[PDB]
Design a protein around this ligand. Structure first.
Ligand SMILES: CC(=O)N1CCC[C@H]1C(=O)N[C@@H]1COC(=O)c2cccc(-c3cccc4nonc34)c2CSC[C@H](C(=O)N(C)C)NC1=O
Ligand SMILES: [Cl-]
Length: 285
């Protein structure tokens, strides 16, 4: 029994929602709210615990970038604060290698980070690792072959189609083949040994196109596009399928949840979130 969790997001302001979707029966669970609202955060799971990393709290009274790391226990329905990151990281990308959380890029006011840091739950400590070759906010992150890939994003001046790879044993970054499309705020995940980059923003329009990276051929190829154009979407993999949750299409905050079946190369709307939102953190446990 595994659930798709969605934490935070944005609709008029940053949200505290923590909701879980059960793909087997189509039900939505309303769980304990985040202590501090956040959009542009990322979610991940380590040892059956859900983590909400970074983001920013946008309120009609003012905005605050977050360096926070919070931990949710599904068995207790409780959030617990963890050690914060060295810097606030809004529009962050996160990846897990060997139970260690990597917080990648993101922004803090006028600063677009290339810095990357790693959290060890067993010690409750963050330590900086080698920074990326490019500053990246709205970066998609995927873990494949025990390497951490940072895909697309925005460097402060340009929207990116470039992507790079981190080798944890060597503590170094290398540029890989660039995507066909410039994407900032895309959903990046790994399914069947491929990295998928779905949606995002190319500097002019929100995208519905989806491309996947094959490591053996080192090429990015387009697969079937989503029904809705979306940036700042949440993304996850559950039982061999890709799930995209919410986002922003340029005017509307989507409640649509689409599901990609790699066998048929088709997307279908499987459910709707309880309300439309963008910039959510998503994870499965
Ligand atoms: C104009 C503007 O940016 N806004 C003014 C008030 C604050 C702020 C505001 O509305 N943000 C909320 C939240 O959204 C996210 O959390 C969020 C999270 C993760 C990634 C991204 C993202 C998408 C596309 C390219 C990106 N390159 O880097 N990150 C990218 C976003 C922003 S989606 C764009 C939409 C917007 O511009 N509106 C006007 C509503 N923004 C949002 O939905
Ligand atoms: Cl924002």
């Amino acid at each position: 029994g595994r659930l798709i969790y969605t934490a935070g997001g944005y609709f008029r302001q940053s949200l505290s929602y923590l909701e879980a979707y059960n793909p087997s029966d189509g039900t939505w669970l309303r769980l304990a709210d985040l202590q501090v609202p956040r959009s542009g955060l990322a979610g991940c799971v380590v040892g059956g615990l859900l983590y909400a990393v970074g983001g920013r709290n946008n309120s009609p009274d003012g905005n605050t970038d977050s360096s926070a790391l919070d931990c949710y226990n599904p068995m207790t329905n409780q959030w617990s604060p963890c050690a914060p990151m060295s810097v606030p990281r809004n529009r962050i990308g996160v990846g897990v290698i060997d139970g260690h959380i990597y917080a990648v890029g993101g922004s803090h006011g006028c600063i677009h980070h290339n810095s990357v840091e790693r959290y060890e739950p067993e010690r409750d400590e963050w330590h900086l690792v080698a920074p990326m070759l490019t500053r990246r906010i709205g970066v998609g992150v995927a873990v494949l072959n025990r390497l951490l890939y940072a895909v697309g994003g925005f460097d402060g001046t340009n929207r990116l189609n470039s992507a790079e790879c981190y080798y944890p044993e060597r503590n170094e970054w290398r540029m890989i083949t660039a995507m066909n499309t410039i994407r900032s705020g895309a959903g990046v995940c790994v399914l069947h040994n491929c990295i998928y980059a779905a949606g995002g923003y190319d500097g002019q329009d929100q995208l519905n196109s989806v491309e996947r990276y094959d490591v053996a051929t080192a090429t990015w190829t387009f697969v079937a596009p989503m029904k809705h154009r979306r940036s700042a979407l949440g993304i996850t993999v559950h039982q061999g399928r890709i799930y995209v949750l919410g986002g922003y299409d340029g005017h509307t905050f989507l409640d649509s949840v689409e599901c990609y079946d790699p066998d048929t190369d088709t997307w279908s709307e499987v459910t709707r979130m309880t309300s439309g939102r963008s910039g959510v953190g998503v994870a499965v446990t």
